[PDB]
């Protein structure tokens, strides 16, 4: 049994027990988050969306951790032009563990 | 038990000596000595002396077992170079390098 939901402007196909990394959410570590906009649920049979989101689809998840991703280095350079600039970046994330998928 | 013998500051280019060293790497000491005896190279004479010294060191300082000995490791390193002057035509002078070498032989029963 898997389901599709949208979180931080992106979509994820998940199943119960799977850990998924999302964009930073404003919830505490031990709290439970519910995603009510489920694009599709497929167990034995598949439930699509006449209109976006299945009628009674709810995905329950527990926040696991908040952190920053690996450092990326931005390099800008203009040859023969006496111009150079460097910058670093670490993107915030939120890991959640899928607990239950409700049809 | 590993036994080492070295000839430091040997008067020969490392490149020339390495040719001979490659012939005996991994061979039994008895076989290695024969190979060196019939190699018509100046470096062969130098390498043979170091090999014989290593065999002697193993027998006297350690626990002998010549029949069991084998050339486990052999390498040649570059030594300090001596700088000389060679007169050329029209008053120009060139530099001559007299290259030396460090010859290391390791013999082991295992």
């Amino acid at each position: 049994m898997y389901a599709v939901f949208q979180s931080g402007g992106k979509q994820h196909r998940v199943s119960e027990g799977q850990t998924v990394r999302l964009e930073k959410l404003d919830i505490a570590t031990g709290e439970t988050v519910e995603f009510a906009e489920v694009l599709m649920i497929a167990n034995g049979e598949e439930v699509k969306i006449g209109v976006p989101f299945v009628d009674g689809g709810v995905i329950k998840a527990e926040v696991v951790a908040h952190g920053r991703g690996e450092k990326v280095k931005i390099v800008k350079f203009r040859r023969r032009k006496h111009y150079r600039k460097q910058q670093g970046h670490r993107q915030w994330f939120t890991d959640v563990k899928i607990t239950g998928i409700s049809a | 038990m590993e036994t080492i013998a070295k000839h430091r500051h040997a008067r020969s280019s490392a490149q020339k000596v390495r040719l001979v060293a490659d012939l005996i790497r991994g061979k039994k000491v008895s076989q290695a000595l024969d190979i060196l005896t019939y190699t018509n190279k100046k470096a062969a004479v130098l390498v043979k002396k170091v090999l014989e010294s290593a065999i002697a060191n193993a027998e006297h300082n350690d626990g002998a077992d010549i029949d069991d000995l084998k050339v486990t490791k052999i390498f040649v390193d570059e030594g300090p170079s001596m700088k000389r002057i060679m007169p050329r035509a029209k008053g120009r002078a060139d530099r001559i390098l007299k290259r030396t070498s460090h010859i290391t032989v390791v013999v082991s029963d295992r």
């Binding site: - | 490659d22 190979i35 019939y38 190699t39």
Partner: protein, 56 residues
């Protein structure tokens, strides 16, 4: 006349790929003295093919 770029250490090794020496492979054993020698050459003691040729 002269190079335009410095050859690499890789190309140097590739040229020296054919510079390896060859061992003698086999040493003959004299029938009488039992002394090793280069084939078709006299021994250090003077023996050749069993005969004591040469008085040295």
């Amino acid at each position: 006349a002269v190079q335009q770029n410095k050859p690499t250490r890789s190309k140097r090794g590739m040229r020296r790929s054919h510079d390896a020496l060859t061992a003698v492979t086999s040493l003959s054993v004299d029938k009488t003295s039992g002394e090793k020698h280069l084939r078709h050459h006299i021994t250090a003691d003077g023996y050749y093919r069993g005969r004591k040729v040469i008085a040295k």
